[PDB]
Amino acid sequence: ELRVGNRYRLGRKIGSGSFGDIYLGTDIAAGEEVAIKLECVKTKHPQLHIESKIYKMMQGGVGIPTIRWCGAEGDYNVMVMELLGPSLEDLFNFCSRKFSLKTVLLLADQMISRIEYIHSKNFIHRDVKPDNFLMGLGKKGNLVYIIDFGLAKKYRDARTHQHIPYRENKNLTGTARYASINTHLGIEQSRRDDLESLGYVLMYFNLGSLPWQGLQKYERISEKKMSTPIEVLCKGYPSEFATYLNFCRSLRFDDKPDYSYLRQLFRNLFHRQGFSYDYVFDWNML
Ligand SMILES: Nc1nc(N)c2nc(-c3cccc(Br)c3)c(N)nc2n1
Ligand SMILES: [Zn+2]
């Protein structure tokens, strides 16, 4: 009967974050389910309050979850957020690990916008992946949310817009599977890299699997990833997916991406395929 002070009662583990796990909770006074993250106050480097600050800076942004509470309670730092629906990875598995082109396109629009909004707030995410996108609940079930800012970093000063310096010899942050080529080469991550990863995420959804899945280990993925040309990776799928990747890989370190161009590629393709813009995803068809 584990209780976060007076207000919340803890439940089962529902998730795994970059720093610590996510538990199902109840707000007793409200009669309402929530998602709860805990950090031991003794933790060597504490980021829970740091990560909450980012969320609250982002608040009001479309597809950004809302923080109900952040603070210290007993021997824990606590973050409580609004409860959201399943991740895209979860839903991928329920859809036999293949999304229809319509679903991938509907996702890509929203996912590109999420990344664009975070960039507008002077942050890069650095762990763009299917697990870090979640569907909303009820009336927001059609909305893709972005979560987990634990690896997120500020890429430019807010007032001056001074961009962070180019560096090399960096250790990889994020999942190797969706990491950009430059990230595998130890380059400092920037806006291009969030977008490049999103490209691998979309192709993952088209294919069911990437050529560098299921093969020392990090050098082996990097190799296969650098050995596989974009045309090879995207063969049998609309050229837009290769065009997206080639554009992202063209971008220099401090370049601003053209988010409208990339959205438009997929919007035009959507039109040519004749799909209804009805937000009816594959999982709604189940
Ligand atoms: N079904 C559901 N709902 C949520 N709201 C949710 N929230 C998160 C999340 C991520 C980072 C920090 C915190 Br607090 C929660 C998560 N990983 N999984 C989740 N799963
Ligand atoms: Zn706090």
In the reported structure, the alpha carbon of residue 83 is separated from the centroid of ligand 1 by a whole-number distance in angstroms of 7
Q: Give the number of other Cβ atoms within 10 Å of residue 11's Cβ.
A: 15
Q: CA-CA distance, 23 to 8, in Å (whole number)?
A: 11
Q: CA-CA distance, 28 to 30, in Å (whole number)?
A: 6
Longest Cα separation, the chain: 58
Q: CA-CA distance, 6 to 57, in Å (whole number)?
A: 27
In the reported structure, the alpha carbon of residue 82 is separated from the centroid of ligand 2 by a whole-number distance in angstroms of 16
Cβ proximity of 95 and 26 under 8 Å = no
Q: Give the number of other Cβ atoms within 10 Å of residue 160's Cβ.
A: 7
Ramachandran assignment for 140, one of left (phi > 0), alpha (psi -120 to 50 degrees), beta (any other): alpha
Query: Measuring from atom 3 of ligand 1, which residue has the nearest CA?
Result: 84
17 is in an annotated binding site: yes
Q: Is 157 an active-site residue? A: no
Among the bound ligands, the one closest to the CA of 76: 2
Q: Give the number of other Cβ atoms within 10 Å of residue 90's Cβ.
A: 15
Amino acid at 17: G
Q: Give the number of other Cβ atoms within 10 Å of residue 269's Cβ.
A: 18
What's the chain's length in residues? Answer: 286
Q: Is residue 1 part of a domain?
A: no
Q: CA-CA distance, 248 to 242, in Å (whole number)?
A: 10
- Residue 167 sits in a domain whose CATH number is 1.10.510.10
Q: CA-CA distance, 195 to 258, in Å (whole number)?
A: 10
The DSSP bridge partners found for residue 34 are 25, 82
Instruction: Return the H-helix or E-strand segment holding 187.
Output: none
276 is in an annotated binding site: no
Q: Could you tell which of 66, 132, 134 is best to mutate to test the pocket of ligand 1, judged by most ligand atoms within 8 Å of the CB? A: 134
91 and 39 co-located in one domain = no
188 and 212 co-located in one domain = yes
Residue 101 CB-density burial (10 A; 0-12 exposed, 13-18 middle, 19+ buried): middle
H helix runs in the chain, sequence order: 48-57, 88-94, 101-120, 181-184, 191-207, 217-227, 230-234, 240-250, 259-272
Range of the domain at 182: 85-285
Distances (CA, A) of 242 to 63, 190, 203, 232, 237: 27, 21, 9, 9, 9
Q: CA-CA distance, 73 to 90, in Å (whole number)?
A: 32
Cβ proximity of 242 and 231 under 8 Å = yes
The DSSP bridge partners found for residue 67 are 81
In the reported structure, the alpha carbon of residue 185 is separated from the centroid of ligand 2 by a whole-number distance in angstroms of 35
Catalytic residue chosen out of the listed positions 27, 75, 90, 127? 127
Q: How far apart are the first and last CA of the chain?
A: 36
Q: Pairing relation of β-strands 144-146 and 133-135?
A: antiparallel
- Residue 29: φ, ψ to 5°: -65, -45
16 is in an annotated binding site: yes
Exposure string over 115-143, b if 16+ CB within 10 A, otherwise e:
bbbbbeebbbbbbbbbbbbbbbeeeeeeb
154 and 263 co-located in one domain = yes
- Residue 100: φ, ψ to 5°: -65, 155
Tokens matching residue 104: 């991938």
Ligand 1 atom closest to residue 37's alpha carbon, by position in its atom list: 14
134 and 276 co-located in one domain = yes
Residue 251 near ligand 1, beta carbon < 6 Å: no
Long-range pairs for 2-5 at CB < 8 Å and ≥24 separation?
Answer: 4/36, 4/38, 4/73, 4/76, 4/78, 4/80, 5/73, 5/74
222 is in an annotated binding site: no
Tokens matching residue 143: 């909305």
Query: Measuring from atom 12 of ligand 1, which residue has the nearest CA?
Result: 148
Cα-Cα-Cα-Cα torsion 66, 156, 245, 131, nearest 10 degrees, comes to -30
Tokens matching residue 146: 């972005």
Q: CA-CA distance, 9 to 1, in Å (whole number)?
A: 7
Task: Return the CA Rg of the chain.
Answer: 19
Distances (CA, A) of 285 to 140, 234, 277: 17, 26, 15
In the reported structure, the alpha carbon of residue 145 is separated from the centroid of ligand 2 by a whole-number distance in angstroms of 22
Looking at residue 156, the DSSP 8-state letter turns out to be B
Nearest by Cα to 241 from 269, 260, 221, 222: 269
Only one residue has tokens 């993925």, namely: 221
The total domain count for the chain is: 2
Q: Is residue 5 part of a domain?
A: no
- Residue 72 sits in a domain whose CATH number is 3.30.200.20
Residue 144 near ligand 1, beta carbon < 6 Å: no
